Amino acid sequence: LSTPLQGIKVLDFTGVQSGPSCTQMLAWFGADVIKIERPGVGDVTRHQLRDIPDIDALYFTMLNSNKRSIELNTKTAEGKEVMEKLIREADILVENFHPGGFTWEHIQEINPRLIFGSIKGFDECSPYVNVKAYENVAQAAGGAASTTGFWDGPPLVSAAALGDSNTGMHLLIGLLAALLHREKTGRGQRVTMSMQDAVLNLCRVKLRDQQRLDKLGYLEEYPQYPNGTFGDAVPRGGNAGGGGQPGWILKCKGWETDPNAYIYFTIQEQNWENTCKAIGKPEWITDPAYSTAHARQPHIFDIFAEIEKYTVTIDKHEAVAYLTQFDIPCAPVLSMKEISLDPSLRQSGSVVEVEQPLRGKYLTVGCPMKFSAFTPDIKAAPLLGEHTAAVLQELGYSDDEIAAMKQNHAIE
Amino acid sequence: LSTPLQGIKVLDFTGVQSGPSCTQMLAWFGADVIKIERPGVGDVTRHQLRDIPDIDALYFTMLNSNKRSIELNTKTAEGKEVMEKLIREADILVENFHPGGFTWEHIQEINPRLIFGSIKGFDECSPYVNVKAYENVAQAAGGAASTTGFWDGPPLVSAAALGDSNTGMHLLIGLLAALLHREKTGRGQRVTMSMQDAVLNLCRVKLRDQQRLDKLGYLEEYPQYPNGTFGDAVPRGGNAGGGGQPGWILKCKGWETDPNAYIYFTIQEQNWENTCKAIGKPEWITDPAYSTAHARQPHIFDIFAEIEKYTVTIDKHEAVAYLTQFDIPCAPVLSMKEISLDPSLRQSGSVVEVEQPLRGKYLTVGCPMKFSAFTPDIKAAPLLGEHTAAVLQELGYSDDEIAAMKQNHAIE
C-alpha cells in the first residue's frame, strides 16, 4: 500500500547490535537498507555465538531482517567510485565504528540532503571519547550498574541491552526527527548518539533520587530508610519499586528449584484496601500503622513477607490469576522459554517466526509498536554479499563492468 | 530557525513516566505539547516524592519541561465543547491510562489527520490486557527480571526504566514514523505500545540465547559453562558480557566502603595481547590455555581474579586511565553523584540545569541525541493550569466566556 519510509534509501555500515537494531527498524518501516560489508568477512555477528556450523549466527539473523547485503572494498579505486555513487543516491548513512576519504564535509557537498547517523560509546567532548565500549561498559558509565542490584552486593549489569539496542532506538528517534526536519529545510544533517547518554536517559529517575538525596540526606521509599544508612550517592535498592509505588519480587511455589518461580508484586497506594482483602488482612485497612504508605514504609518488608507466605504456596500463574482479581499490579517473572512459546506474543507480532535460508526457522522480536495503517512484514536476513550484483546494476553498471570488478577483487 | 516538529500540536493526557517521557521529547523537538490535567489534582508526579513542601516534585519537573498545562473537566458540557475544539486542531493525542465519549471512531471523523498514541501495560490480545502495570511489573513480564542478577539469587529488577521511559521512547518512534507516513497518505492513524513489548525488545539477545540453549543444551559464554548446570530457560549470568565479548565487574580500591568503587572490564577477543601486557602476563599470549577465547572460557574467572588483584589496588579512575592505554574496553562504575557533577555531561548537554519557578535550579537529563542543524532549548515545567486561559483564548473563546467557565467550575 504505503509505507512510512517508502522510497527512503539507507547506507548501512553498522555492526554488532546498537547500529543494526536501528537500521532493522528502518527496514521494517519500509526503507531500503543496504548493509555494506567487508568482502569475505562481514558483520561480526555473522560468526559470533553460532549454534550451527558455518552459517550466519542467530546474533545476526535477529538484528538484520529485511536488509540487503553488498560486499564492498572501499580501498580500491572501483570501490571508491561505487561508494560515491551510493552516497549521491542515499537518504541516510549510518555507522557505529569504535573510536578507532569521504568526510562529513565532502558528503554534504556530494549530497546536501543526506542525513548522517553515528553511534559512539561517548559524547565528543567526553574524556572517554576514544575508549571502546561494549554493552556493559556503557551501563557502568551511564549510571545503571551503580544503581542496579542489592545494597550489599556489587554493581549489577542489566540483561536489557541498555547500551546497544537502547542506543539504537535513540538514534532511530534522531533519524526520524531529522527526516521530519529535512521536510522543511530541504537539507539533511548529522545526528549523533552515545551509548552513555542512552543509558543515562533510561536512568532519569535515578538523577531525581540523587537530587532528593543531596537535599534531604535520605530517600523515604528506599529500603535503607529508616533503619539503614545513606551515603553521598543513590544506592542499589534490590527489587524496590523505583517510583512512587512500592513493590518487590516474591517467591512462588517451586522457587527452590525454578529460578523463575516468582512474581513482581506492587503495593499501589490507592489499592491498599483491595490488597488487604486479597491477603486476608482486613484489620490492616484501619490500623494506623498500615493505612498509609508513609506509615507502611518503616516495616514494609514485614508486609512483603506476609504476602509471600501466600505466594510461595501456589504456582506464580495462579498467584497472578488470584491477586489481579483485587486489581493488584503484578505479573509473573516470565522466562525466555515461556516468552518464546507465548501464543499471544505470537498473535500480537511480538515474537515472530521467520524462515531463514540454510537454517530454517528461527524466532525474533518483531516490530514493538503497532500501527493501524500499516503492518510490517518481517523477513529473512541477507547472506553475505547476496545483493552485491543487484545494487551495482541499480547504480548503472553493466554486466561486463560488474564481472570485471569481481575478477579484479579475485586477483588482488 | 527551524525545528523538526515546528507547528505540530499535541494533546497530552499522559501521566507518570512512560507517556510524559515521550511528549517531553516531542516538545524538545519543537512541538507544542499541551498537558491536559484534572482540575486541582493534575499529574500524580506533581505530588509524588516531593523534596520541597507544596511545590511540584522533581519527578514532575524532570519529565515535563517545555510543556504547557491546562486544567480541564471533560465531564462538563463546557469541557466537552473545549475538548472537541482541541481535537479538531491537534496533530497528535497521547494517553497512557491504566486499562481501567470521544472514541477513536469519532476522533477520525472529527480530525482525519490526527495520530492517536497509546501506551498500555500489555498488548490488546494479551491475557494480561486488563492488568495494571508499573515499571517493574513490565520488567518481570518482559523477560528482563528473569535474566538479570545472579544465578543463585532472585530475579533482579533494573534501575533503568525499561518499562516506562523505554516504553515512552518506543511510542515516540511510532509517532514520528506515523508523521512521516501521514506525509504520504494525508491521514493520521493509531499507534499503540505496551510496556511488555518495550522490555522484550531490549532483551532481544536473550531470546537468541534461549534458542541456542533449546538447540545445544548449553551456552558456552555463560558462567554456568562448563562446570555448572543449564535448565530449560536462559539463566541469570551475574555481570557477564552478554554478547560475544566476555566481561565482569571488578572491585577497585575502596570497594569495602564505597559501593561504586568498581569498573567494568571487557576481555575483547582481538585485544587479548594488549590485555596480557596491561596485566603483566606476557606468557598468556602464547599459552594454549589462554591464547583463544574458547580456551579461556573454562577458567575465565581465574583470569578476572588475576586482573582484579591489580584493580583493587588503585582508584577506579586510575585503573581506567591505565588500562585504556592498552585499548581495553572498560569504564568506572559512575554513581549518580559523579554523573550529576560531570563537566562534560554538562558541556555535552546530557545533564542540564534548569530554573524552575518557586523551586529554583534542578538538574534533568537533556536531549540524548545531538543534531547539527538544531539545538533544543530545555525549559521549566509548567505549573498546574498555568496555560489554561491562553489555550482557551487560542481556541477563540472570549474573556467573558473564559471567566464564566471558571466561575461555573468554582460553583460546581
- How would you label B29-48 residue by residue, b for 16+ Cβ within 10 Å and e otherwise? bbbbbbbbbebeebbbbbbb
Q: Closest to A235 (Cβ–Cβ): which among B208, B243, B259?
A: B259
User: Considering only alpha carbons, which residue of chain B is nearest residue A375?
Assistant: B191
Q: How far apart are CA A283 and CA A277, in angstroms?
A: 9
For A302, the grid coordinates are: 514485614
* Residues A202, A111 share a domain: yes
Q: Does A229 touch chain B (CB under 8 A)?
A: no
- Which DSSP letter does residue A8 get? -
Q: Kindly give, in sequence order, each residue whose CB lies less than 8 Å from that of residue A16, ignoring residues fewer than 6 positions away.
A: A43, A44, A45, A96, A164, B243
**How far is the CA of A371 from the CAs of A3, A26, A138, B194, in angstroms?**
11, 15, 32, 13
DSSP collapsed to 3 states, A92-118: EEEECCCCCCCCHHHHHHHCCCCEEEE
Residue B117 pairs in a beta bridge with B94, B191
Q: Closest to A191 (Cβ–Cβ): which among B171, B259, B371?
A: B371
Q: Does A294 touch chain B (CB under 8 A)?
A: no
Q: Closest to A247 (Cβ–Cβ): which among B136, B153, B339?
A: B136
Q: Does A176 touch chain B (CB under 8 A)?
A: yes
Instruction: Report the candidate in A61, A32, A37, A1 with the shortest Cα–Cα distance to residue A359.
Output: A61
Instruction: Report the candidate in A300, A306, A235, A238 with the shortest Cα–Cα distance to residue A269.
Output: A300
CATH number at residue B243: 3.30.1540.10
- Max intra-chain CA distance, chain B: 87
Find the DSSP H helices in B312-370.
316-323, 336-341, 343-347
* Residues A325, A244 share a domain: yes
User: Considering only alpha carbons, which residue of chain A is nearest residue B8?
Assistant: A180
Do residues B296 and B284 lie in contact, with contact meaning Cβ atoms separated by under 8 Å? no
Question: Which of A65, A108, A157, A182 to mutate: most B Cβ within 10 Å?
Answer: A157
* Residues A139, A1 share a domain: yes
Q: How far is CA A377 from the centre of its chain?
A: 20
DSSP secondary structure string for all residues of A334-381: --HHHHHH-HHHHHTTSEEEEEETTTEEEEEE--SSEESS------PP
Bridging pattern class, strands B32-37 and B370-371: unpaired
* Residues A83, A99 share a domain: yes
Count the domains in chain A. 2
Do residues B125 and B197 lie in contact, with contact meaning Cβ atoms separated by under 8 Å? no
Q: How far apart are CA B391 and CA B382, in angstroms?
A: 13
Place of cell 545483493: A387
Which candidate in A164, A315, A342, A400 is catalytic? A164
Q: Which of A270, A303, A334 is the last residue of a domain?
A: A334
Q: Does B216 touch chain A (CB under 8 A)?
A: yes
Q: Which of A286, A301, A334 is the last residue of a domain?
A: A334
Q: How far apart are CA B344 and CA B349, in angstroms?
A: 8
**Is B17 one of the annotated binding-site residues?**
yes
**Is B184 one of the annotated binding-site residues?**
no
Q: How far is CA A286 from the centre of its chain?
A: 44
* Residues B52, B39 share a domain: yes
CATH number at residue A392: 3.40.50.10540
Phi, psi (5° rounding) for residue B119? -110, 135
The one-letter code for the residue type at A125 is: C
Q: Does B45 touch chain A (CB under 8 A)?
A: yes
Confirm whether B377 is a catalytic residue.
Answer: no
Domain range enclosing A282: 238-334
Resolution for this experimental structure (Å):
2.3
Bridging pattern class, strands A32-37 and A9-12: parallel
Question: Which of A205, A221, A268, A311 to mutate: most B Cβ within 10 Å?
Answer: A205
DSSP secondary structure string for all residues of B200-246: HHHTHHHHHHHHHHHHHSS-TTSTTTTTS---SSPPP-TT--SSSS-
Which candidate in B32, B56, B91, B164 is catalytic? B164
Burial class (CB in 10 A: 0-12, 13-18, 19+), B410: exposed
Q: How far apart are CA A322 and CA A177, in angstroms?
A: 44
Instruction: Report the candidate in A128, A119, A162 with the shortest Cα–Cα distance to residue A144.
Output: A162
How many CA atoms within 13 Å lie on the side-chain side of A94? 32
Q: Which of A308, A334, A360 is the last residue of a domain?
A: A334
* Residues A410, A310 share a domain: no
* Residues A348, A220 share a domain: yes
DSSP secondary structure string for all residues of A276-342: HHHTT-GGGGT-TTTSSHHHHGGGHHHHHHHHHHHHTTS-HHHHHHHHGGGT--EEE---HHHHHH-
Q: Kindly give, in sequence order, each residue whose CB lies less than 8 Å from that of residue B122, ignoring residues fewer than 6 positions away.
A: B128, B129, B131, B133, B141, B194, B195, B196
* Residues A365, A396 share a domain: yes
- Max intra-chain CA distance, chain A: 87
> Helix, strand, coil % (nearest 5) of chain A?
40, 15, 45
**B191/A372 Cβ within 8 A:** yes
Q: How far apart are CA A191 and CA A195, in angstroms?
A: 14
Q: Kindly give, in sequence order, each residue whose CB lies less than 8 Å from that of residue B84, ignoring residues fewer than 6 positions away.
A: B102, B110
* Residues A133, A31 share a domain: yes
- Which DSSP letter does residue A120 get? E
**How far is the CA of A99 from the CAs of B268, B327, B372, B384, in angstroms?**
15, 10, 19, 46
Q: Kindly give, in sequence order, each residue whose CB lies less than 8 Å from that of residue B355, ignoring residues fewer than 6 positions away.
A: B361, B380
Instruction: Report the candidate in A295, A303, A395 with the shortest Cα–Cα distance to residue A68.
Output: A395
Which residues in chain A are closer than 8 Å to B264, comparing Cβ atoms?
Answer: 136-137, 139-140, 145, 157
Instruction: Report the candidate in A173, A177, A162 with the shortest Cα–Cα distance to residue A22.
Output: A173
Q: How far apart are CA A82 and CA B185, in angstroms?
A: 34
* Residues B320, B341 share a domain: no
**How far is the CA of B176 from the CAs of A4, A351, B29, B67, B182, in angstroms?**
9, 23, 11, 18, 10
- Three-state SS at B118: strand
Place of cell 508513609: A294
Number of residues written out for chain B = 412
Q: Does B200 touch chain A (CB under 8 A)?
A: yes
For A372, the grid coordinates are: 493501524
Question: Which of A29, A156, A352 to mutate: most B Cβ within 10 Å?
Answer: A156
Instruction: Report the candidate in A107, A115, A72, A69 with the shortest Cα–Cα distance to residue A87.
Output: A107
Residue B332 pairs in a beta bridge with B263
* Residues B129, B109 share a domain: yes
Bridging pattern class, strands B247-251 and A68-71: unpaired
Phi, psi (5° rounding) for residue A23? -70, -25
How many CA atoms within 13 Å lie on the side-chain side of B234? 32
**Is A269 one of the annotated binding-site residues?**
yes
* Residues B214, B330 share a domain: no
DSSP secondary structure string for all residues of B47-92: TTT-SSTTS--HHHHTT-TT-EEEE--TTSHHHHHHHHHHHHH-SE
**Cα Rg of chain A, angstroms:** 26
Which residues in chain B are closer than 8 Å to A214, comparing Cβ atoms?
Answer: 337, 340
Instruction: Report the candidate in A370, A137, A249, A332 with the shortest Cα–Cα distance to residue B143.
Output: A332
Q: Does A186 touch chain B (CB under 8 A)?
A: no
